[PDB]
Amino acid sequence: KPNVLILLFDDMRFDTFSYRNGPVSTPNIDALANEGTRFDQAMTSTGLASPSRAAMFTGRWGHKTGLDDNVGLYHSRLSELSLSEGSVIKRATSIGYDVSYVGKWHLGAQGPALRGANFMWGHDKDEERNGRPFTPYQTQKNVARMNAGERDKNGEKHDYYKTLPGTYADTVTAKEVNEGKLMLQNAAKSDKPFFGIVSFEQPHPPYRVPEPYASMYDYKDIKLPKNFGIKRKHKPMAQDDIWWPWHDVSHMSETDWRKAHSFYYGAIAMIDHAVGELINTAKEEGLYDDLHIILVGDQGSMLGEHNLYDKGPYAYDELMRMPLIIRDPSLEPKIINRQVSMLDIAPTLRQWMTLPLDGDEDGRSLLPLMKQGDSADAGKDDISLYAYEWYNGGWFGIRAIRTPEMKFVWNPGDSRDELYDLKNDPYEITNQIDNPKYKKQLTDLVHKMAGELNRIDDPSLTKFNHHMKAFL
Amino acid sequence: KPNVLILLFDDMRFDTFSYRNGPVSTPNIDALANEGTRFDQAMTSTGLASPSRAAMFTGRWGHKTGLDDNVGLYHSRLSELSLSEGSVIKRATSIGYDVSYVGKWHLGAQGPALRGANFMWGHDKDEERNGRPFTPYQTQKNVARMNAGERDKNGEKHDYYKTLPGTYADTVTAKEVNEGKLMLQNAAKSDKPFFGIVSFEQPHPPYRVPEPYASMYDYKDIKLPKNFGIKRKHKPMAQDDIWWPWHDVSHMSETDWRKAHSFYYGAIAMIDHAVGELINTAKEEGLYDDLHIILVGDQGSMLGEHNLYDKGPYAYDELMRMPLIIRDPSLEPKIINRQVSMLDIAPTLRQWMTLPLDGDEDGRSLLPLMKQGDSADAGKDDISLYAYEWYNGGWFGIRAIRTPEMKFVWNPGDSRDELYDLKNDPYEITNQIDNPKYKKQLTDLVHKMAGELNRIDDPSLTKFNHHMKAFL
Amino acid sequence: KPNVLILLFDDMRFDTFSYRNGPVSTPNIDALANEGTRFDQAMTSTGLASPSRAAMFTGRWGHKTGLDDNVGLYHSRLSELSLSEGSVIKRATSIGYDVSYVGKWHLGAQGPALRGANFMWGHDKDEERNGRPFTPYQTQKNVARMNAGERDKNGEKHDYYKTLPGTYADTVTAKEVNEGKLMLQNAAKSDKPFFGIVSFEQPHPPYRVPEPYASMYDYKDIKLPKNFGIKRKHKPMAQDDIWWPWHDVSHMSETDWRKAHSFYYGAIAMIDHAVGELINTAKEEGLYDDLHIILVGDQGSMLGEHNLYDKGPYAYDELMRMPLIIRDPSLEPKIINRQVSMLDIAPTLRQWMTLPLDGDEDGRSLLPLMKQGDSADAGKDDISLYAYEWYNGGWFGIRAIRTPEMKFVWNPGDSRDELYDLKNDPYEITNQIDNPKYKKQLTDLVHKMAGELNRIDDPSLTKFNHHMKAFL
Amino acid sequence: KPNVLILLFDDMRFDTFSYRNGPVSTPNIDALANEGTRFDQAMTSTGLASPSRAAMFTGRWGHKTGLDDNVGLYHSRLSELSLSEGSVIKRATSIGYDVSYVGKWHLGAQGPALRGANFMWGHDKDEERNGRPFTPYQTQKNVARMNAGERDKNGEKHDYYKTLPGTYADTVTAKEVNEGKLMLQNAAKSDKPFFGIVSFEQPHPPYRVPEPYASMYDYKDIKLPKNFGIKRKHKPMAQDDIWWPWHDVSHMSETDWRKAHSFYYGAIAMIDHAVGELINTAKEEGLYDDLHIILVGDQGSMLGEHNLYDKGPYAYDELMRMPLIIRDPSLEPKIINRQVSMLDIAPTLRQWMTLPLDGDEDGRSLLPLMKQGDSADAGKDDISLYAYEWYNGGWFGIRAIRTPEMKFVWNPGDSRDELYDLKNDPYEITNQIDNPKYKKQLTDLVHKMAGELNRIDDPSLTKFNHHMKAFL
Ligand SMILES: O=S(=O)(O)O[C@@H]1[C@H](O)[C@@H](O)[C@H](O[C@@H]2[C@@H]3OC[C@H]2O[C@H](O)[C@@H]3O)O[C@@H]1CO
Ligand SMILES: O=S(=O)(O)O[C@@H]1[C@H](O)[C@@H](O)[C@H](O[C@@H]2[C@@H]3OC[C@H]2O[C@H](O)[C@@H]3O)O[C@@H]1CO
Ligand SMILES: O=S(=O)(O)O[C@@H]1[C@H](O)[C@@H](O)[C@H](O[C@@H]2[C@@H]3OC[C@H]2O[C@H](O)[C@@H]3O)O[C@@H]1CO
Ligand SMILES: O=S(=O)(O)O[C@@H]1[C@H](O)[C@@H](O)[C@H](O[C@@H]2[C@@H]3OC[C@H]2O[C@H](O)[C@@H]3O)O[C@@H]1CO
Ligand SMILES: [Ca+2]
Ligand SMILES: [Ca+2]
Ligand SMILES: [Ca+2]
Ligand SMILES: [Ca+2]
Ligand SMILES: [Ca+2]
Ligand SMILES: [Ca+2]
Ligand SMILES: [Ca+2]
Ligand SMILES: [Ca+2]
Ligand SMILES: [Ca+2]
Ligand SMILES: [Ca+2]
Ligand SMILES: [Ca+2]
Ligand SMILES: [Ca+2]
Ligand SMILES: [Ca+2]
Ligand SMILES: [Ca+2]
């Protein structure tokens, strides 16, 4: 029974790290990437926390667990992942692992503790269950101030980017690191196998860091991508609507967007420091050499691509792609360019730990890819499936199928679907849904989507077959 | 088997008519009110079309029929009322009624015809089923024009109020009347009992009429109510959000709101003319003397009360109250001040027509009240129940319980409930939810709400018992 | 809030009493019949304990409560009525009744107590929930002895009829009476309204009584009915199979069947004594003059009609008909010949006691009939609906519709349905299902059955529409 | 896309063949066993046709497909496998296989044809769907004749064993072979990949063969096993009851049981001839060298072990074990002694044929075992899971877990479970369930069963946790 450590981050993009030729020097994450298996084409299940984390920890899609929206936020109907869904936490406990959890959970008050973990520290540790959804009255008021031409301290906009007072040592991130260190120190003194999860709120917006991280990337030198700040042409209406109050970006100057980037980059630099602190502790405690590690982001984050901020009900690569490194100390490092999914994390843990199966596995173990490289998937279609059933109480039913060359997005709450040619239009600027030159590609993607919905027993296949009847 | 005629209107308020001391002379509706049973405290089930109409025609709440949102609109998940829900239409057909339908249906393409009616004319008559939701790209563009300081013809704002070209004879309303006349003429030549439904889109916004109705009420002379144009204090966040694009009323001048009223009043005057035309035809065809008539609005309409336009996920009296007249030619006219519900229409039709029962009746027959007056309900609590599960793809789960003196609104997708003292604050300006002086009233209303949710087997009772635990 | 007493008996036939011109002098029950409302055409919902009692106490059919088989018996899948089904017991407790229960419950261990009653005494009072089904190894062994030509003490067959040692004072029946007396004496000392249920295992087989009841009816003088001991002609196979081990009656002589009658009659004589003891106690305690009383049998019992013993999956009148007397001290006594149902008991209690509604009422209040006589139902079809979904782990799906003149039984687990002309063949000897002279009656009964299944939302309507396609 | 032939037999035991050292010379089946992969410890999913065949063809357990009883038989509630369950038949058709079906289907009228196969010949081919259950009036009458001391032609008992008139050429088996030959001859003329299923009613009882098979095995020379004709000691009551009318074996002499063996052996001899005819046709048509073959029995058959005949709700090896040979022409022959399951057939077909996944796979592909031998399962628990939810309308909920050394049977409709030490008591004579010497084994098997029920999402896990509370 191997020791396992998961380092989970909130809205951490695939592309920022120096090992991906990104703009932030991340030597600790780069070292882990170089020692482990790089999943460079990893895709989340949903660009939203609770659905992505339920999928990650249960290995099933939201229509199977019922966890298909964020919990505890205006105006979601959901409060918690059912206690019948024990997840990898309870499964590991059942075969004698000591499981520990630190930080962001967002699957219901006390959840890790109710499933047998030591919930050492985090927002949800001492909360009562069935609480009222958090309703963003303060964010609403502050975005109205931004629209009225007000700014916060030092001309910042604290619903978007913020200099935190103090130092790294004062941060939530440092507290989570300190609890992670305690978790590792305690594990080293136990005869029981260890499964530890350290889950950081960073780099979730508003993009916030203390000095020196707040000023380490000059906003004036940020390279903005080809899809930055464009008017969306022939995109679905759900990309227009102000779902969360900060999604009104009408007041954002180019300077504001550049600062959103420079603060995000500072947050990634601070995350790199946090990862180094935990890896150094694992080494000092004699756990590192045999430690099976996953580093993953729950989804990405929009920094003004398509004039969007944060996240919402859509399928753009900046949100859909996630960073993923899986380090198995028994394997030679490899780079995997086959697409993989958040649904593949639970089966990988299941194979590592010989977890009992508690039900379906909607994904596949990544061990074959970690052992053999891309050739493990010889003869298989290179696809990923993404869902966006709900955004905080709004129903969308979104499904996307992504190949290396194309993406098809079904928006069943709209009349407008999306079709992107990722080979010629990797920035997803041009919706080709109405372009007859793409009839063969759309037909193929519709067939692949129907097959996936059938495989996972998604009840929206009935509606899909109506909407796409011309292509079946 | 009596002949039955339903005259159904879309967003027709309880209060406009001259028989209710309202500002519009409505002699044809007044005459029907004076000949029939006035339900002066009638309440809709939901301030939204498809849920209210499914409840009206099936006699069950949306959680039982599955019809708990509008159909066919961005971003609802629903397309049609299940064909397993035959409604009063199929039930009447099954015992030998000739059923006819004209006008607005909004329960799925071809629905009345699929349930055995002659669907003589209307939007949904020749539409394919399972169509894509109508997504309001044009309304979105036009509201952006209004926010940019543009206006339409003659300085109007055609997403709010509009002079139609031509005359009454050119209108959808006149076409629906003409088909209603044909329906009555045909019924008079048949030996079979008749059940006819004429369902008008009027007075649904934008508030539109031709001359002379467009100019018959001077906007300068409109009396605006105490809750007109106020800033909402301590109200739920769902009252703030721009659900449909025209809900952005930030560009509306007092003149614009006054014109919304004067065009609405013109629409009610035109409806009165339409009702007269159908009643005169019933008289000319020898059907009127034995004709059992229902005149009802599916819900009201907001004309700037609480600075709200049209409708949305809320429970204010201007939307929740509905006009209702039920004329049984065998009964002396009476005014009923006991509250009644949209759920009471199907059981009243069931008693009139001896319809077979196809399942639960969530309401009660109104015949006892029509026969005896208010004393029929001696010893019963005077309550009404209102739901707002969904608004066009947004989930809210709203429940309201209303007594003559108080209203309690549960907003389970928010942290803020509502409590109104209708005796001291009939305009519902002051939310008393946090006022300890109302602890007894809130406790009583919470107990009444729990009992109603139990009675109708609403699965949200579990969440209710958590949210309201302090008062149970 | 009136005081209510229910006297419930297990397998007590409609016809044994002297007030029904039956063979047993029952002066106490006759007196109650003469003082109350006689429902002389009452019908149980199912000829099996747990389903009948769940229907009685909840007012909903088994497909709605899930309680569609006996609990706790080989080889039923069921253990208890869900605690979400509070029944009239919890509903009465909720409005301030003191509810007390004595004797047979058979709806799950501790059930009356878990729903707020004082469970004073009875088999289920101190039992653990979720116990293993009682499997009749002893009965199996003893019926094998009977088939081998053995007899029990005094030549009796103790799986069919038995002389108990001692006297009435030593019996379970006397203990249940004594607890009933305590219940009434305690109720007389309280100002709180009283709801008491005394539920007797008598006269459930084996038919067992002490002297002098054991020898009170001479077996040689028993009048056997026209359908006694016949070979079943063209009847469904479920009437042939040995479901419970004592259903093998191949070893029964005519003397054994006569003695099963003698002992059944002795048990009815002892029941009449028990009823007298409780009514006399109510009189002595000053409760009788205002006491609202129901006396009912859960179903009948087969004494060799169609060569059947006890009960099983079938719909014969001797099992389907039930005794019912409802005494409302405010009403003149009347005889009701309209059919009524076990589903009508909960709504009658709900009207008497002003119980809150916890859901559907599949039956109707009997107060209108108790007040007006048969004319209350002028213009209603005189039908009863009977179900036999399960017998102790065997699935049958049986439905029967009964009119004063005809009975149609659907046996969906068989190829043979039943059709009886009760006018010309009240003993139900001749199955007319294939007789084209009865095509009009069968068609009418099929239509009535389809209507009833639709009304109660019985999911077997789909299969019914296949099986009866020729008749719809 | 390889060509696939399935040879399926009805109630064919694992042990009769000469390759298993059994009493019948079966050179054709032995040759296939010697050329292919022998699964000598194969286990069916249920000892009943429709459930076993639904599991075989869908790769999911009955609680997932709803196909958990025989269809079309007194007194099952079921008529057909849902057409939403396309099975391997529709999945193979979807990727361009020509699928053909001959013989016994027993999953609903027309089922193979409705799923895209050429249903060449068989009982279900031209039948109407939703027919009334076959009710065994003839068998009931004839078993009554046997109990009255009558015999059939030549002193036979035709509900148990029967000489057919004519020769092999006149048999149903020869017709099924002849259609199988046509299927192979037609497949040889197509370039399209072939998937053929030939499903024989033999050797289902009554055990029936023409000469010379009827007299080939001398009944006087039959070797009877150690568990033949014993009185069952401390066994569950469902083993005693006469579920199907021929289960009354009280009239069977030792000669009658010996002849049931003689005729069963004659039927296996005739099956070996049938298999030879199809394999020889495959060779003559040039298909054999690349033909991927499965030969399997749906379950075994009881020949008087524990004094049982045919099958019923129980888990004895003679019924639970099944013959299985899988021949992949690309692989070296191997004998597999690891247990395998009927749930492993669909995934094996899915791997051979690259079938799309239509949902869960409750089993595993057998290719790794076929390639590597038993070592493929190194470090896996050697278990099999068996269910007996229903027998022809009787509910039993039975679950069995089997290891090489032990078997635990949960009988939730009884108070008696079973525990067999297969090492010391391979004939399953001694129920050890109450033997404290076996507490460790029972505890381990209970844990393994709980894990399996959780893995397949069997809703009976809730009741299992109550019944087995002492052991969890
Ligand atoms: O596999 S595990 O994660 O160890 O958990 C299994 C099973 O998957 C899980 O559903 C169950 O959870 C039970 C279930 O819901 C909540 C919890 O207790 C309740 O009473 C229900 O039995 O726990 C099992 C392992 O115990
Ligand atoms: O009561 S009615 O309105 O006359 O309709 C009843 C019943 O309520 C309704 O559910 C049923 O509808 C059937 C059902 O769904 C659609 C329609 O056909 C399908 O095949 C199903 O049988 O119709 C009955 C009366 O026929
Ligand atoms: O109407 S009552 O008989 O008073 O009971 C109601 C309701 O009908 C009943 O379902 C509920 O039972 C709750 C329910 O299951 C058991 C009990 O507690 C659980 O937690 C569930 O909420 O009790 C109410 C009265 O409170
Ligand atoms: O995978 S397949 O065997 O090819 O079948 C799939 C799917 O698994 C199956 O459920 C579906 O069956 C549809 C479904 O029920 C019957 C049939 O038509 C109905 O309208 C429903 O949509 O068929 C697909 C292949 O198309
Ligand atoms: Ca996130
Ligand atoms: Ca921080
Ligand atoms: Ca599944
Ligand atoms: Ca599927
Ligand atoms: Ca409306
Ligand atoms: Ca109009
Ligand atoms: Ca209901
Ligand atoms: Ca309820
Ligand atoms: Ca009984
Ligand atoms: Ca007794
Ligand atoms: Ca119904
Ligand atoms: Ca079989
Ligand atoms: Ca044959
Ligand atoms: Ca599970």
* Beta bridge partner(s), residue A398: A388
Which atom of ligand 2 is nearest the CA belonging to B93?
4
User: CA nearest A47: which of A455, A402, A381, A336?
Assistant: A402
CA dist., res. B385 & res. C203, Å (int): 48
Coil, strand or helix: which one is B40? Answer: coil
User: Chains with 3 or more CB pairs closer than 8 angstroms to D?
Assistant: A, C
Assess whether the C-beta atom of C350 lies below 6 angstroms from ligand 3.
Answer: no
Coil, strand or helix: which one is C141? Answer: helix
CA diameter of chain D: 65
Protein residue whose Cα sits closest to atom 19 of ligand 2: B84
Protein residue whose Cα sits closest to atom 4 of ligand 3: C91
Within 8 A by CB and 6+ apart from A256, the residues are A157, A160, A161
State which residue of chain C sits closest to B362, comparing Cα positions.
C360
Contact of A83 with A129, CB cutoff 8 Å = no
CA dist., res. C323 & res. C297, Å (int): 6
**Do D454 and A360 count as a contact with CB atoms less than 8 A apart?**
no
How far the first Cα of chain A sits from its last, in Å, is 47
CA dist., res. B399 & res. B412, Å (int): 9
Within 8 A by CB and 6+ apart from C328, the residues are C36, C37, C292, C352, C367, C370
CA dist., res. A43 & res. A55, Å (int): 12
Sign of the Cα pseudo-torsion (C378, C380, C383, C387, in order): negative
CA dist., res. D388 & res. A392, Å (int): 45
Nearest to B414 among A135, A396, A397 (CB): A135
Residues of chain A positioned with their CB less than 8 A from the CB of D358 = 454-455
Distance C452 CA to ligand 13 centre (A): 25
CA dist., res. D236 & res. D412, Å (int): 10
Q: Which of D60, D80, D82, D83 for mutating ligand 4's site (highest number of atoms within 8 Å of CB)?
A: D83
Within 8 A by CB and 6+ apart from B449, the residues are B385, B399, B401, B408, B410, B464, B468
Locate tokens 């099936």: which residue?
B58
Distance C452 CA to ligand 15 centre (A): 9
* Beta bridge partner(s), residue D292: D4
Half-sphere exposure of A98 (CA within 13 A, CB side): 13
* Beta bridge partner(s), residue B173: none
φ, ψ of residue D80 to 5 degrees: the values are -160, 150
Half-sphere exposure of C252 (CA within 13 A, CB side): 23
Peptide bond into B306 cis (omega under 30): no
* Beta bridge partner(s), residue C302: C310
Helix axes A254-284, A172-188, angle to 10 degrees: 20
Residues of chain B positioned with their CB less than 8 A from the CB of A129 = 466
What is the H or E stretch that residue B293 is in? strand B292-297
Nearest to B137 among A77, A237, A396 (CB): A237
Protein residue whose Cα sits closest to atom 14 of ligand 1: A84
Ligand nearest to the CA of D200: 17
Contact of A6 with A196, CB cutoff 8 Å = yes
Ligand nearest to the CA of C162: 14
Domains of chain A: 4-374 (3.40.720.10), 384-471 (3.30.1120.10)
Tell me if chain C has a CB within 8 Å of the CB of B452.
Answer: no
Protein residue whose Cα sits closest to atom 15 of ligand 4: D84
When scoring D455, D461, D462, D465 by the number of chain A Cβ atoms within 10 A, the one with the most, hence best to mutate, is: D455
Locate tokens 């279609």: which residue?
A381
Assess whether the C-beta atom of D90 lies below 6 angstroms from ligand 4.
Answer: yes
The separation between CA C261 and the C-alpha centre of its own chain, rounded to angstroms, equals 18
Hey, how many other C-beta atoms are within 10 angstroms of the C-beta on D96? 9
CA dist., res. D140 & res. C148, Å (int): 22
Which structural technique was applied?
X-ray
Within 8 A by CB and 6+ apart from B17, the residues are B24, B26, B29, B30, B33, B268, B323
CA dist., res. B60 & res. D187, Å (int): 57
Hey, how many other C-beta atoms are within 10 angstroms of the C-beta on D460? 18
Rounded (10°) CA dihedral A74, A78, A83, A85: -110
Tell me if chain D has a CB within 8 Å of the CB of C63.
Answer: no
Rounded (10°) CA dihedral B4, B10, B11, B17: -50
Contact of B448 with B472, CB cutoff 8 Å = no
DSSP for C35-102, written as a single string: HSEEETTEE-S-SSHHHHHHHHHHSS-HHHHS--S-SSBTT-S-----TT--HHHHHHHHTT-EEEEE
For chain C, positions 333-362, list CB contacts with chain B under 8 A: 356-360
In the chain, the amino acid numbered A248 is D
Q: How far is CA B255 from CA A81, B217, B221, B259, C183, in A?
A: 51, 13, 11, 6, 75
Helices and strands, counts by H and E, chain A = 13, 18
Contact of C450 with C468, CB cutoff 8 Å = yes
The two structure tokens encoding residue A320: 């859909």
User: CA nearest D319: which of D205, D159, D213, D215?
Assistant: D205
Measure in Å the smallest separation between the Cα of D7 and chain A Cα atoms. Answer: 28
Sign of the Cα pseudo-torsion (C280, C283, C284, C285, in order): positive
CA dist., res. D9 & res. D23, Å (int): 18
Tell me if chain D has a CB within 8 Å of the CB of C397.
Answer: yes
For chain B, positions 222-241, list CB contacts with chain A under 8 A: 236-238, 240-241
Contact of D57 with D390, CB cutoff 8 Å = no
User: CA nearest C132: which of C62, C52, C70, C77?
Assistant: C77
Locate tokens 């045919």: which residue?
D310
Contact of A233 with A294, CB cutoff 8 Å = no
The two structure tokens encoding residue C403: 């009119």
The separation between CA C297 and the C-alpha centre of its own chain, rounded to angstroms, equals 4
When scoring D357, D452, D472 by the number of chain A Cβ atoms within 10 A, the one with the most, hence best to mutate, is: D357
- Quickly list H helices, A297-378: 317-320, 345-353, 367-372
In the chain, the amino acid numbered A80 is E
Which atom of ligand 3 is nearest the CA belonging to B465?
22
Which atom of ligand 4 is nearest the CA belonging to D356?
1
Tell me if chain A has a CB within 8 Å of the CB of B141.
Answer: no
Which burial class, exposed, middle or buried, applies to D131 when counting CB atoms under 10 A from its CB (0-12, 13-18, 19+)? middle
Protein residue whose Cα sits closest to atom 5 of ligand 4: D86
φ, ψ of residue C134 to 5 degrees: the values are -65, 120
The separation between CA B28 and the C-alpha centre of its own chain, rounded to angstroms, equals 20
The two structure tokens encoding residue D101: 């079906």
Contact of D453 with D399, CB cutoff 8 Å = yes
Within 8 A by CB and 6+ apart from B437, the residues are none
Contact of B449 with B410, CB cutoff 8 Å = yes
The separation between CA B340 and the C-alpha centre of its own chain, rounded to angstroms, equals 13
Q: If you ran DSSP here, which 8-state letter would residue D60 be given?
A: S
**Do A454 and D356 count as a contact with CB atoms less than 8 A apart?**
yes
DSSP for A68-118, written as a single string: -S-SSBTT-S-----TT--HHHHHHHHTT-EEEEEE---SSTTHHHHTT-E
Q: How far is CA C370 from CA C43, C378, D408, in A?
A: 17, 14, 58
In the chain, the amino acid numbered B393 is G
The two structure tokens encoding residue D182: 């046509």
Tell me if chain C has a CB within 8 Å of the CB of D66.
Answer: no
Measure in Å the smallest separation between the Cα of B162 and chain A Cα atoms. Answer: 25
B292-297 and B4-9 beta bridge pairing: parallel
Locate tokens 């939703």: which residue?
D130
Query: Resolution of the coordinates in A?
Result: 1.8
